[PDB]
């Protein structure tokens, strides 16, 4: 019964093995602990928004949306309808990005490595969408606690439609490479099986629940924005292993395509941030012509808006699971406390029980099926 | 509404079992994957010929910072310190005093590019379009010191890139 | 896509589908890189009258939380935090994969 230290995204793993079997597996984290939560207390709410881009850096606008929803709830305001539709559209695009990354990185770690390139071409196209709407490819800072920063450019919807109508064939090529392959099935079937009750007690969420047959999805049970106005299906697993979770992720990619089609067809007209200049900055022309607009611009960009005192826990169905924020306001323009809840934290904490009685080569598969990014785990 | 991803039970009819046995013994799905890779070999690759070909960008793109001026050549910055106040990374350092003609101007305007997160909050906080994020992104450096920009460097960047900067601002200002 | 007929047939037969119908490379079907100017409407608070800020002030309508059962100061049926969740329905679009 020897000990192995598989050290240096970046993870240290201390495990005891007897022969080939894994007897114990303790992850050591903190190699990407940046002290985000302490840094946020020294910023205004707008200044704190861009940290959520860097929390889970495969799904940026989803973290943006969660933070914005928390601040909106504390502010007792609501975004305009068009902003909500834009938010849900880009949230589904972000879900597509995250699921591509998760599945192709899983396959590459197993050894496939061709679908990685095949689908990172599509990832580059969606990065183009991000850049055209915000000017940045990944760290976008587009979704604000009053709506969105800017309206869409005049030809963006057409190009999103053109992209989304060919993506199903790319998913089909992915499935042709992976779904029915006997080597992939032997690497994934009956690996990392977790029961429903254990998954509930261990704090799992998202696919890690739905793979075990739990019928739960935050966009269906606790809808935010315009989600209750779109229809889609929730894929549900049956054996609670890596193979069922992979199938669930592919099906969620397809359902994201469905939701994106609906969002494209029902995009409404109007403004894109809340018409309340004490929260959302005025337009540049108004700022340069009106006294109140100039004053409110000055104060919003120097002091920031004050948030009434109180505490909220706001959670969303991020592509990796339930992503939450416990936000405490003391009445000023800077948050008093911001605790970030990342699903990968609980998933990595459950890695030890998920890898009991398995081979060393199965720990990589379990890590890939947990969909871990250490930016959100360490914060 | 929910769907089952893996809830199908295989047929027990002799034909289904023989088809599964043929799949096991003759490796039909492996041949199918090989055919997929073969078909992908014969389609045109997505590679562009950098640096002779470039990646498409938008007028909203955030690149290297620049300081602008009016058509008269007088600088737009009037040292309000709004960009310094809003900078999430505290990357802007500003010092100001009355000029020899009584004008409100800066004597120090520094941006530490190794602290900057390129969020563009400074250009949207500016009331006179003085500080902007330009279109240039190919400004890698061999030392850490050359990435600490002072006012002369930013004014030189503005004078270098003003044509493209003005065209981009003209293209995008009706959304701002 | 400028691929010969024989190469198109070979790649189609190897892939098992028609590839020219859904190409992953983009062509003149994308939108132009120069667009007309937008007009960008205004919001509902852009009225010239009947528009006092005290009637549309979200932040000032927030209140401190309601206190029930401060420890410092009937049949009685049992209750739950919310009504029980209703069972989901089985996707009369594609129930099984």
């Amino acid at each position: 019964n020897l000990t192995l230290n598989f050290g240096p995204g970046v993870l240290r793993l201390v495990m005891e093995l007897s022969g080939e079997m894994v007897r114990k597996c303790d992850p050591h984290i903190g190699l990407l602990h940046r002290g985000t939560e302490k840094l946020i207390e020294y910023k205004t709410y707008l200044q704190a928004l861009p940290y959520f881009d860097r929390l889970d850096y495969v799904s940026m606008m989803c973290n943006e949306q969660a933070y914005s929803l928390a601040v909106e709830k504390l502010l007792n305001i609501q975004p305009p309808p068009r902003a909500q539709w834009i938010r849900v559209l880009f949230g589904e695009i972000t879900r597509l990005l995250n699921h591509i990354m998760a599945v192709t990185t899983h396959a590459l770690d197993i050894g496939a490595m061709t679908p990685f390139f095949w689908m990172f071409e599509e990832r580059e196209k969606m990065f183009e969408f991000y850049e055209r709407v915000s000017g940045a490819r990944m760290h976008a800072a587009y979704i604000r606690p009053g709506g969105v920063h800017q309206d869409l450019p005049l030809g963006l919807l057409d190009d999103i439609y053109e992209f989304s109508k060919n993506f199903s064939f790319r998913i089909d090529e992915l499935e042709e490479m992976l779904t029915n392959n006997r080597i992939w099935r032997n690497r994934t079937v009956d690996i990392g099986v977790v029961t429903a009750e254990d998954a509930l007690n261990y704090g799992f969420s998202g696919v890690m629940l739905r793979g075990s047959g739990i019928q739960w999805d935050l966009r269906k049970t606790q809808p935010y924005d315009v989600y209750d106005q779109v229809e889609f299906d929730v894929p549900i697993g049956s054996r609670g292993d890596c193979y069922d979770r992979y199938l669930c992720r592919v099906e969620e990619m397809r359902q994201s395509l469905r939701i994106i089609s609906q969002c494209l067809n029902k995009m409404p007209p109007g403004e894109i941030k809340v018409d309340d200049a004490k929260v959302s900055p005025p337009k540049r022309a108004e700022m340069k012509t009106s006294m109140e607009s100039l004053i409110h611009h000055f104060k919003l960009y120097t002091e920031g808006y004050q948030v009434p005192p109180g505490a909220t826990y706001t959670a969303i169905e991020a592509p990796k699971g339930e992503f939450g924020v416990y936000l405490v306001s003391d009445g000023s323009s800077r948050p008093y406390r911001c605790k970030i809840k990342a699903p990968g934290f609980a998933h990595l904490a459950g890695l030890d029980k998920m890898s009991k009685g398995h081979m060393l080569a199965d720990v990589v598969a379990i890590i890939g099926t947990q969909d871990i990014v250490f930016g959100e785990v360490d914060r | 509404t929910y769907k089952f991803v893996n809830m199908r039970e295989p047929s027990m009819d002799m034909k289904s079992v023989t088809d599964r046995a043929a799949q096991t013994l003759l490796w039909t799905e492996l041949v199918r994957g090989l055919g997929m890779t073969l078909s992908y070999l014969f389609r045109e690759p997505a590679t562009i010929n950098y640096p002779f070909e470039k990646g498409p960008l938008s007028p909203r793109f955030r690149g290297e910072h620049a300081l602008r001026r009016y058509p008269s050549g007088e600088e737009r910055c009037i040292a309000c310190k709004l960009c310094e106040a809003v900078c999430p990374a505290q990357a802007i350092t500003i010092e100001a005093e009355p000029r020899a003609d009584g004008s409100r101007r800066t004597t120090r305007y520094d941006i530490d590019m190794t602290k900057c997160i390129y969020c563009g909050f400074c250009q949207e906080a500016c009331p006179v379009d003085a500080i902007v994020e330009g279109p240039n992104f190919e400004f890698s450096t061999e030392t850490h010191e050359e990435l600490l920009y002072n006012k002369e460097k930013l004014l030189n960047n503005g004078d270098k890139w003003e044509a493209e900067i003005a065209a981009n601002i003209q293209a995008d200002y009706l959304y701002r | 896509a400028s691929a010969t007929r024989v190469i198109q047939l070979l790649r189609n037969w190897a892939s098992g589908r028609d590839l020219q119908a859904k190409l992953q490379l983009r062509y003149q079907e994308i939108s132009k890189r120069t667009q007309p100017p937008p007009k960008l409407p205004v919001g509902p608070s852009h009225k010239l009258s009947n528009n006092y800020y005290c009637t549309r002030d979200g932040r000032r309508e927030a209140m401190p939380p309601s206190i029930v059962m401060s420890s410092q100061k009937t049949e009685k049926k049992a209750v739950t935090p919310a009504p029980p969740i209703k069972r989901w329905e089985l996707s009369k679009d594609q129930p099984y994969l």
């Binding site: 397809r254 469905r258 089609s261 995009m267 | - | -």
Partner: peptide, 29 residues
């Protein structure tokens, strides 16, 4: 004079977007 102009879907909407899994059976017993 000028009316509102912003990025909108075309009149009549967009064409149907395929999303269902399509893995055909080539065919040989």
């Amino acid at each position: 004079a000028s009316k509102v102009k912003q990025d909108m879907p075309p009149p009549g909407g967009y064409g149907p977007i395929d999303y269902k899994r399509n893995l055909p059976r080539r065919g040989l017993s």
